[PDB]
């Protein structure tokens, strides 16, 4: 909490009382030769990390999501799965792809084997994310089995049983009394010290913060629309769009299966359809005395996270 990083990509000193490392760092990025060789290489790495993650400059002064799952490259994903995975990192997104193409049994087995092989992990981040994804896949398997035993009878008529009873019993045995909330606490303290930003992924309701922030932004935007006021700086609508894209890119590029659950779907559906409503209000806004267009990514988000009835409501409004 020494500084505050905002969606636009500008840092503001919020709690740092001592010397400001980011204030000097940004100018240092903008005479660097006086730094040591190791220090220069480390600064190069830091600059690459910061510019790739969108932390550009300080307060005083679009998105591209790289993933086959987001773009629905269902055949490139199959080809990637077929290829022998050289490294565990390449086998993590491979398990994510296996999950994305159904194949939840294969995805669960692959995640379990990744966890098994992640003993010698340099950092253990892959192990933590694999635990999260395996819990998510077990949840998906359980809910799908319940649906197939229920609605899966009215719908499809027949009984499907995609997962063998032996696999279901084994996964229930392994996942018995598995509190996901504790997963981050039951980690080496080095991981907890270093990977504090991944703590939010542990809790079974990790979109509550994002949902609450989107609720606040939606209320602000609707108040602006009702009053008829004019926003000057970075409008709350732009903040909503920026946070939506940040969440989408973080969840898809890191190959997290929680991106396929109803909570995230509803979060994206509300983040959109609030940009759209605000844009429509902006279009039909009377002039006084004193635009938004949908890209490819917006089309993909609306197609994926919107039910047909939700699109119908958006059209009606």
């Amino acid at each position: 909490y020494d500084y505050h990083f905002e969606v636009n990509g500008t840092v503001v000193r919020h709690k740092n009382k001592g010397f400001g490392y980011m204030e000097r760092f940004f100018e240092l990025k903008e005479e660097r030769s006086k730094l040591s060789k190791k220090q220069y290489e480390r600064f190069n790495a830091l600059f690459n990390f910061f510019e790739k993650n969108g932390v550009i400059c300080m307060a005083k002064d679009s998105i591209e999501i790289n993933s086959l799952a987001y773009h629905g490259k269902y055949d490139v994903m199959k080809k990637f799965i077929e290829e022998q995975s050289v490294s565990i990192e390449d086998d993590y997104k491979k398990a994510f792809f296996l999950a994305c193409l159904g194949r939840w049994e294969e995805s669960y087995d692959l995640y379990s084997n990744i966890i098994l092989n992640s003993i010698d992990e340099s950092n253990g981040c892959v192990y933590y994310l694999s635990q999260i994804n395996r819990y998510r896949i077990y949840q998906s398997i359980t809910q799908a089995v319940t649906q197939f035993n229920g609605l899966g009878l009215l719908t499809f008529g027949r009984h499907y049983k995609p997962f063998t009873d032996e696999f279901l019993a084994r996964i229930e045995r392994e996942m018995t009394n598995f509190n996901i909330d504790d997963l981050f606490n039951g980690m080496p303290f080095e991981f907890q010290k270093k990977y504090k930003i991944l703590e939010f992924l542990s809790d079974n309701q990790f979109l509550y913060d994002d949902t609450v922030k989107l609720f606040e932004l939606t209320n602000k935007v609707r108040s602006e629309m009702s009053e008829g006021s004019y926003s000057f700086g970075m409008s709350s609508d732009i903040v909503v769009l920026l946070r939506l894209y940040d969440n989408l890119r973080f969840l898809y590029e890191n190959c997290l299966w929680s991106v396929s659950f109803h909570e995230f779907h509803q979060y994206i559906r509300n983040s959109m359809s609030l940009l759209i409503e605000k844009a429509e209000y902006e279009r039909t806004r009377d002039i006084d005395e004193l635009g938004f267009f949908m890209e490819y990514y917006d089309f993909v988000n609306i197609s994926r996270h919107f039910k047909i009835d939700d699109i119908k409501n958006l059209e009606r409004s």
């Binding site: 998906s140 809910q143 609605l151 899966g152 009878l153 909570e263 009835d309």
Partner: protein
């Protein structure tokens, strides 16, 4: 706060029974001759606390709806199968179905008093 009975069309067996939760009847209007009063009517119904009958379940291991409050009868109800998973485990199953209309009958829903 009435009750909904889902029954097999041919045999007449009650597939299940639950509690009606929502109903949307939205019928509205490229598509000199005689007026035919063409309309595109849709009826959707979301059901609550649906438990499938043990007999029909064991048998499974066209449909009708009878929603009784005053007295409503939906013939040819197609059950939509949209399945979503919540990361929060799960809480009761919610069933949604759309009223279907046969060409010959041309009737989608019936109201009985």
């Amino acid at each position: 706060t009435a009750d909904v009975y889902f029954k097999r069309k041919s045999d007449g067996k009650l597939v299940f029974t639950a509690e009606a939760q929502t109903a949307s009847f939205s019928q509205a209007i490229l598509r000199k001759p005689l007026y035919i009063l063409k309309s595109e009517k849709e009826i959707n119904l979301t059901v609550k606390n649906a438990f499938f009958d043990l007999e029909w379940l064991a048998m499974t291991q066209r449909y009708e709806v009878e929603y009784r409050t005053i007295y409503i009868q939906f013939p040819n109800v197609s059950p939509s199968g949209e399945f979503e998973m919540s990361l929060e485990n799960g809480l009761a199953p919610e069933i949604k179905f759309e009223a279907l209309a046969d060409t010959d009958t041309d009737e989608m829903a019936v109201v009985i008093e």
